[PDB]
Assembly symmetry: C3
Homo-oligomer: 113 residues x 3
């Protein structure tokens, strides 16, 4: 029938969008580095869950940071040799900040407004 | 009817993908910092509109930067105590650069090719 | 047709999602800068292909870096005047790191686990 064909053509054009939206949806990474060695941290936001890989000159290992998010951005600064890191984990419209300051990750004061 | 069932099954498999892709599409952040205090700037690209939160040691407030974009990246350097910031705002395939150099945001020379 | 209207209404609500997912799908950028001049590098991940634009104080030109990825993050550090740049290109779940250390991009040790 022609009535059944109209929905068949509509379902063929709509399945064409479902492949282009799954082709672009990869992970989402943030990296910062400090010192002369250096030291590197790479935050990987995979499936609404962020994790932290670390380089200290020798090899790579898994850092402590373990927080939820779809998008991540990071900045770090030294006060002498001590590294201060701020990771910004985004879910929906809720950017939530995390703070490393030598011994422990803590939720930060950061508010979007 | 079996002719009405073929579209019911096809519509059940297609509608399942449209909800999960919209559920995971979150906002997108860039951050930079400078000095010892420090000073931080977080740019948040939400609904094709980027905005700038600031921290200068006391609390968080809203910065001047107000430009359109779906994706943002940022880098900053000091010439002494003066901060220079370049924010790269992306819409479609048009990366457009915004320069802060002490007094006023301006469009930068940046061309993708 | 009343029998064919059930899929016509389902297609009217599902085409109500493919416009908003194609409106927000822009390119994805990552910038870093060093020195006092400065020198900037902006990496642009477009259509699973990343490219590198360079500013060294004169105008913008096209950098060597030419690797595949849908998402990109960058950090860099100086050992004296020499720049070292690690770019983290992401496809699917495969974060693959690229290293610049003066003469040549090389695949780096980085492993996600
Ligand atoms: O040495 C490993 C630790 O390094 C710190 O600077 C932080 O990045 C922690 O998240 C990490 O667990
Ligand atoms: O000590 C925690 C505080 O650190 C500051 O540098 C900022 O990042 C604040 O958002 C945070 O609450
Ligand atoms: O002090 C607030 C101002 O700080 C500057 O360095 C810039 O980041 C401006 O966008 C901001 O309005
Ligand atoms: O002064 C504005 C200029 O600043 C330079 O450092 C670059 O960022 C250029 O793209 C920009 O046009
Ligand atoms: O001078 C151009 C070169 O600069 C280097 O520092 C790297 O960024 C290369 O990718 C680039 O080709
Ligand atoms: O020299 C190459 C090496 O550089 C280090 O700083 C790390 O980025 C390693 O992942 C990489 O293998």
């Amino acid at each position: 029938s022609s009535e059944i064909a109209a929905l068949k053509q509509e379902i063929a054009a709509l399945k064409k969008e479902i492949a282009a939206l799954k082709a672009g949806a990869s992970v989402q990474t943030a990296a910062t580095s400090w010192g002369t060695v250096p030291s590197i941290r790479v935050y990987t936001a995979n499936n609404g869950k962020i994790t932290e890989r670390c380089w200290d000159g020798k090899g790579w290992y898994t850092g402590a940071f373990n927080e939820p998010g779809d998008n991540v951005s990071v900045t770090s600064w030294l006060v002498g040799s001590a590294i201060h890191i701020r990771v910004y984990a985004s879910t929906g419209t809720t950017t939530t900040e995390w703070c490393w300051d030598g011994n422990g990750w803590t939720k930060g004061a950061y508010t979007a407004t």
